[PDB]
Design a protein around this ligand. Structure first.
Ligand code: 0HK
Ligand code: OLC
Ligand code: OLA
Ligand code: OLA
Length: 416
């Protein structure tokens, strides 16, 4: 048993040190590389805070508890450790949920969500995650004994009072793990479905006009759906019909036909994008720019289009379309596509780490719901510690799927 105690203590000390060093590296990287100070990474910083809490306090307190075979720190210390544990881990779950929704709405809502993403909005979401986790788990763990009247926790053990019943534990697993995991998986499936296709007209108009599966009200209040069209998943045929109608309307327009016949395929795609945004009449209003584009004067037409209401209403979309006219390449949209693909890979890595490390404990909860104390305490301990290991593996996720994080980590480690 002594050999076992030494081995467990050594392994868990090593794992705790790796967790601490990794999340401190994440924080130092966020601090000393301005290229990492993006809206996406503030959520990752929140995750690193939860993981550092897990690595310093949770791992060491839990391992001392299991090695001593009892709790020898007092009931208040047990309740404080359990509260810290459950609040920080629920905060991690909420942070993963808000990361999922942030990425999803960035992909699907460019005007209503993506153009409005500031670090303060992200900080609101982060603080709400932490505050809701706190007000849900700390009062329960600390005052359920006062709610029932008596404290039915054994003096030598450290467990939460109400989570002994299998039905309450099952409800907690459903509302706290299974429903969040289902939501994150559905959101990631949608994000991934929008990251398989190469750079084309569909992806261009999706970047400019996000894809919505449900009928919504546009900026003017009209019932639009899909890619700016006025409830399904295969809107590709609808998109083809709309771009077919757009080409047919451009070819039947006096000001748009010669320029459309003279432009490259990429520039015809830019013209179709402008027709999608404004219409045939709106694009026909740019007679000067159309004559500049028909005469292959790309720089002149670009600087002429940068002086319109279209450039001031939507700066990013107009800049991309103007760059497409000016260069005749997809690079302005290629850049957004590779950025979104990188974000998606990072999201998938952190989601898989979470799901893999936390799945055994919650499967044990399910089995214990459908049996009578059949899951041994050894397995409970292993599943608990495995959920801790999420906090250890998350910085390795950042290092394996973000080249900026990887470069900053190598700079810090080698002390460059
Ligand atoms: C190792 N933990 C620190 C403890 C045990 C695990 O708990 C979980 O996986 C559970 O689904 C459940 C525990 C009991 C019933 S359902 C969650 C609890 C809070 C959010 S999700 C993971 C985390 C969480 O802080 C608890
Ligand atoms: C334990 C229960 C705690 C209950 C909740 C109390 C704490 C809430 C704090 C939220 C800070 C999040 C806001 C900061 C996140 C990003 C916003 C921002 O702009 O931060 C810029 C700066 O660079 C970043 O250090
Ligand atoms: C998505 C995460 C879901 C989190 C689920 C939280 C589980 C809540 C379980 C029990 C809380 C019961 C109400 C506690 C009241 C606090 C004061 C008291 O204990 O009397
Ligand atoms: C031994 C237990 C360690 C389990 C490690 C789980 C790895 C999660 C997958 C990942 O690396 O992202």
């Amino acid at each position: 048993r002594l050999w076992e105690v030494i081995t467990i203590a050594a392994v868990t000390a090593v794992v705790s040190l790796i967790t601490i060093v990794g999340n401190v590296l994440v924080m130092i990287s966020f601090k000393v590389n301005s290229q990492l100070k993006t809206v996406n990474n503030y959520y990752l910083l929140s995750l690193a805070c939860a993981d550092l809490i897990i690595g310093i306090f949770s791992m060491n307190l839990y391992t001392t508890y299991i090695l001593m075979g009892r709790w020898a720190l007092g009931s208040l210390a047990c309740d404080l450790w359990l509260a810290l544990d459950y609040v920080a881990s629920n905060a991690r779950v909420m942070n993963l949920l808000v990361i999922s929704f942030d990425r999803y709405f960035s992909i699907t809502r460019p005007l209503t969500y993506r153009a409005k993403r500031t670090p303060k909005r992200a900080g609101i979401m982060i603080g709400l995650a932490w505050l809701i986790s706190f007000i849900l788990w700390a009062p329960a763990i600390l005052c359920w004994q006062y709610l029932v009247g008596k404290r039915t926790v054994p003096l030598d053990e450290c467990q939460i009072q109400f989570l002994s019943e299998p039905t309450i534990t099952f409800g907690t697993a459903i509302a706290a793990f299974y429903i969040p995991v289902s939501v994150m998986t559905i959101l990631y499936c949608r994000i991934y479905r929008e990251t398989e296709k190469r750079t084309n007209i569909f992806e261009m108009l999706r970047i400019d006009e996000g894809l919505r599966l449900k009928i919504y009200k546009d900026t003017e209040g009209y019932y639009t759906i899909g890619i700016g069209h006025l409830t399904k998943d295969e809107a590709e045929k609808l998109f083809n019909q709309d771009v077919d109608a757009a080409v047919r309307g451009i070819l039947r327009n006096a000001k748009l036909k010669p320029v459309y016949d003279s432009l490259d395929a990429v520039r015809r795609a830019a013209l179709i994008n402008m027709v999608f945004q404004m219409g045939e009449t709106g694009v026909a209003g740019f007679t000067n720019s159309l004559r500049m584009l028909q005469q292959k004067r790309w720089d002149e037409a670009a600087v002429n289009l940068a002086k319109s209401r279209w450039y001031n209403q939507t700066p990013n979309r107009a800049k991309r379309v103007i760059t497409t006219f000016r260069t005749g390449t997809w690079d302005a949209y290629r850049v957004v596509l590779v950025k979104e693909r990188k974000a998606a890979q990072t999201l998938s890595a952190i989601l898989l780490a979470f799901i893999i490390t936390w799945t055994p404990y919650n499967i044990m909860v399910l089995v214990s719901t459908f049996c009578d104390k059949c899951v041994p305490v050894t397995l409970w301990h292993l599943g608990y510690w495995l959920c801790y290991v999420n906090s250890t593996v998350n910085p390795i996720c950042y290092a394996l799927c973000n080249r900026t994080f990887r470069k900053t980590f190598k700079m810090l480690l080698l002390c460059r």
